[model samples]
Target: MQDILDFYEEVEKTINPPNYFEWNTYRVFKKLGSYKNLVPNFKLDDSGHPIGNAIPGVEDILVEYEHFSILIECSLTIGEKQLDYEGDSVVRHLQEYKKKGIEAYTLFLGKSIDLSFARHIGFNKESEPVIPLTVDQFKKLVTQLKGDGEHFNPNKLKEILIKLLRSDLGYDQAEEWLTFIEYNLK
Candidate 1:
């Protein structure tokens, strides 16, 4: 518990914090006040030991609920209407979690992608996945991959995204991803 707080603090103070994972995780502490116990920078592993990979795609935290676990990732949007399917580690980590039966999502911390504008995690529409693949090979290769759970509410996510866009990242709605909060999430 205390260790988690300490680690989260260090993550914010020293590093870029990976799409503000520590900051957002801290916010979740209050926002989802009903739930207790949010583990920081953890991955499910055999020995309860760290996987010593310099670049791992696992999510930043695991918020525990009575029946299941929720994985959280705060991915940097960089204020574009575009969220790359292959880039920003969305696919690798998502597939990994799905493979392990863990459900997760990355925060859309960038711009106003017009909520309905085609939210893509790793693949687009048409050229979409089973949803059409950009290249069918890359698509077919990951056929069984899946994402589960709201993990959390997307409306809250939009609110957070809008707030952060205006205040922290220093961008505006008109020039950037500012459109309308008219869309839905999976």
Candidate 2:
């Protein structure tokens, strides 16, 4: 619906989008049908509405699918700041989930991803599964899902990850890889 797109615009115009990012991402997953299975780590006010970011150690969103779960970490920070602010936390959150022995992946949603960070997460065979995606790419995927008879499916998301993981491209090819995903994921 147009309302979803409007919400994206509201997020885009916020002074510090990251402060507002977690709650909107939660609503996004809910709109995509996560419903009762979606849990956000956002700090809540007396009205139970998200008023701050996730707690110190938690990721932004946790959505359970039929066979697996996704831990999403959203950030509006760009450039080197992303590396400093989000790089370790994303991995740490994923590892925290790993300790529970759950089948999960960390989805890092940012304004733009730092290649060095993306490389470390995606290319390291021994690292936890982490998918780096931009807010634009996220919007496009949502748009595609909104088409008639089209719907969100966790397996499709997993397939996207597997496709990227199977590619032999180097870390420097991060943009190319993301572009391929942006256009071809549908």
Candidate 3:
């Protein structure tokens, strides 16, 4: 667990750029799954490590819980380019999971999210719980769980998702959205 925490600090100092942001994020989640109760799955090479960003047609990480699961799609790309590159793909991946009749939600993790895309995702009833979080926010979430004895609370996460979905605090405030989720997790 401490290594997972240290992984964030060593991110820039050790791994190469762009690729580090992509591949190392998978490593981060993979390590987190060992400490947390969630069952996280991602593709790996023969060397049994993440080689790059998520696969072309699959979610970056698929985390399974007791009653539901989460499809995590990560991106280093920020702002409009993020939406242009991932907007449809994220939904398509989630839709594919939903097709399996699993109660799944998508976590769109990015360096930073495009507010317009975030807002657009929130109101899409078909994808009622497509939550967006910055990489920093995701780290904070893991830290919070560690502080709380590493107990995974699916219901609390669901509540946070619904709360954020229903919130209209700002049509354009992605940071505010992040803070709202942080507060709710408490």
Candidate 4:
């Protein structure tokens, strides 16, 4: 737990430095699986096999501001059999962030599903409706929320995402939108 907090703190330092504004982020996983290039080395078992019981490496972290708050999340998935392990770690981290008043969430894809789903479950409260926010919508919402004014732009992110989906932006494009958003936000 402390390690995770320390890692995030380091990310915050890099993304929210005093001289310039940049966002730092990451996603942790139990195994490299097909993502060995992104994550190397493993805590192996006595038999020299990768510790299937351990946590996957973290990747695809991005730092950006949303509504005056820095938002961090990760793309996570697990085989059907490893759902318990994966879900447990994800839930634990989310709970920890909630206690610290940080806004965090996870985007996951089920084993049989090719598309992804996102949920922004509050740490201290019940999980909010898993409303999908496109990378663009997410950026706009965060900016609007952090903007200084009396008027608030609610659910603009969702609206934009839905519109994009209707326009036939494939899943890959959707994820790319997030990457673009993160880069621009930085």
Candidate 5:
């Protein structure tokens, strides 16, 4: 999150992981993906390990099917003024989605991030929209994914578990988390 506040210095291409919001955005998307037919893809790092849920951005998630895909940038808040480059980041992706002919979105965890703020910040009217989602609210959109029968790709799930551990908590907590995921999710 330092970069959000400190724009004086140039940040490297690596993920500085400003906060859990960005981390959890990718983490939860990977988990939900592992349990459903949401996306059938992953992006391998130079070392050939999966570092992405196949959606790339400051923080994002991807949904795909039948030659179509939607890339969603996840945000914690959309207003209260003084938005960082993060909000603008979503707009850049819109050109990407339009160019690729795929859909684009920004999903905020803050329920107050309504269309008014989003419309002015990152989207054109009805071109591509943003959303606010929560644990209980996401199920309403699950029908668009697979049957949600709890079927998942175990190998990919393991990959995401390891990825999140290393990226978010680093190796310091891998010992405990590996066991936790294996026990709880495996």
Candidate 6:
């Protein structure tokens, strides 16, 4: 864990910690529910992973103009295994959205795991994969991306941030993003 701590220190020099809404945006927006409320008798997996509960109110963003309408759905995930889950969920969710005549994209938030595992699973065919970010680096990246006007797409911004996080500071800094996203996105 020392390596992780070291990486975090370096990144902290650059990024600012994310607020609660940014870290738990889905929860604040009601896109996901508290685990305790999901099932009366729900149980976590052997590894302490929660099971049998869906995130609540996750849906597509609608941009309606005077002449046309557009829908944007964002998806998130953490870790490689979860990335697999996110990938499957993306297809499933998109299908559900399509049935309702909407367009969406999957936003995978790569959790901090072993770097090799991330490379094996999280890397995508179309774009770079989510890595990890320190609180400081994330703040700087968000500012940069937002300034570029490309940060409106949360997923894409997340992807870029993750890459920078991993490349410069290593994957252990993911908590920075988690904390930030949970607080600010709301």
Superposition error at 83 for model 5 (Å): 4.8
Better of 4 and 5 by lDDT: 5
Report residue 62 deviation for candidate 2 (angstroms): 0.5
Q: Which wins on lDDT, candidate 1 or candidate 4?
A: 1
CA lDDT for candidate 4: 0.31
Local accuracy by lDDT, each model: 0.36, 0.73, 0.65, 0.31, 0.41, 0.35
TM-scores of all predicted structures:
0.38, 0.83, 0.73, 0.29, 0.42, 0.31
Per-residue C-alpha lDDT of model 6 across residues 1-186, encoded as one tens digit per residue: 223223433432333222111223222112222121211122335864324343444323233322222222222234455445444443344345446543223333322332333343233422323333323343344455444544244445435534442433223544453444444431
Residue 130, model 1: Cα distance from true site in angstroms: 16
Candidate with more favorable, higher lDDT: 1 or 2: 2
Pairs of residues clashing in candidate 5: 1-18
- In model 4, which regions exceed 4 Å deviation? 1-62, 68-79, 109-155, 158-186
Worst 10 residues of 2 by lDDT: 118-127
70-147, model 5: which lDDT tens digit per residue?
454544454444145345666565556667665344444432343344334433424544333432233333322334
Best by TM-score: 2
**Candidates, ranked, lDDT:** 2, 3, 5, 1, 6, 4
Query: Between prediction 2 and prediction 5, which has the larger lDDT?
Result: 2
**Each prediction's Cα RMSD?**
13.6, 2.8, 4.0, 14.8, 15.1, 13.2
Candidate 3 stretches with Cα past 4 Å from truth are 9-49, 125-128, 167-179, 182-186
> In candidate 2, residue 122 scores what lDDT?
62
Candidate 2 lDDT for residue 77: 81
| Model 5, residue 166: C-alpha shift (Å) | 38
User: What TM-score does prediction 6 earn?
Assistant: 0.31
Under the 3 Å rule for N, CA and C atoms, how many clashes does model 1 have? 9
Clashing pairs in 1: 79-110, 79-111, 85-122, 112-177, 125-128, 128-131, 128-132, 128-133, 129-132
The number of clashing residue pairs in each candidate reads: 9, 0, 0, 12, 1, 26
